[PDB]
């Protein structure tokens, strides 16, 4: 009935979210970001071509997992210079089966919470990149186009030793239950 359209909407949201998460957590210098209107609020999006392509490729590979409801979580993992996870924005996604301004509005909520989440988060070390983790089951065809293969996440990235938990937002509609929450280390 709906389904494709949910994934479409969801995938685009995650794109916009990942950019904004990189801007507010200062993973790349603020100078690469330009202001864009998105869900009718001010957001920040990278102008750096290769970064933009990295993000697009990641999410275009996630899309088929979303499209047939195989994504348990999409985690933006922030990593320090030594490639150790300092911070994780976990988007945890369910699409239960079963029984449009409302979706925009509930997505806008997550965007807004990200914008101001600097007010509730311990500011990160210098020298940071990120990666994306996707919790799923056992896309091997968009990996092969793209030249953007995926590989099992290392145990150092999945486990965070004794993490602090900072929820930002929850939505619970009929179509979609999503909780966004951060994990920090001590």
């Amino acid at each position: 009935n709906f389904g494709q359209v949910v994934a479409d909407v969801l995938c685009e949201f995650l794109e916009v979210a990942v950019h904004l998460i990189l801007y507010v957590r200062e993973v790349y210098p603020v100078g690469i970001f330009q202001k864009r209107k998105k869900y009718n609020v001010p957001v920040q999006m990278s102008c750096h071509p290769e970064l933009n392509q990295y993000i697009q490729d990641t999410l275009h590979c996630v899309k088929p997992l979303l499209e047939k409801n195989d994504v348990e979580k999409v985690v933006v993992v922030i990593l320090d210079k030594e490639h150790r996870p300092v911070e994780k924005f976990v988007f945890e996604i369910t699409q239960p089966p079963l029984l449009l301004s409302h979706v925009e509005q509930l997505l806008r909520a997550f965007i807004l919470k990200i914008s101001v989440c600097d007010a509730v988060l311990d500011h990160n070390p210098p020298g940071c990149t990120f990666t994306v983790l996707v919790h799923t089951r056992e896309m091997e065809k968009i990996q092969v186009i793209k030249d953007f293969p995926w590989i099992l996440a290392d145990e150092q990235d999945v486990h965070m030793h004794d993490p602090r938990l900072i929820p930002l937002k929850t939505m619970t509609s009929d179509i979609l239950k999503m909780q966004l929450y951060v994990e920090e280390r001590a």
Binding site: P29, G31, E50, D157
Partner: peptide, 23 residues
């Protein structure tokens, strides 16, 4: 069986982007 996966490539480094931003 439940699995976590990641992109094999790393995102652009902060340094590489900084240089892009300079030049």
């Amino acid at each position: 069986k439940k699995i976590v996966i990641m992109p094999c490539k790393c995102a652009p480094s902060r340094q590489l982007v900084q240089v892009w931003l300079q030049a």
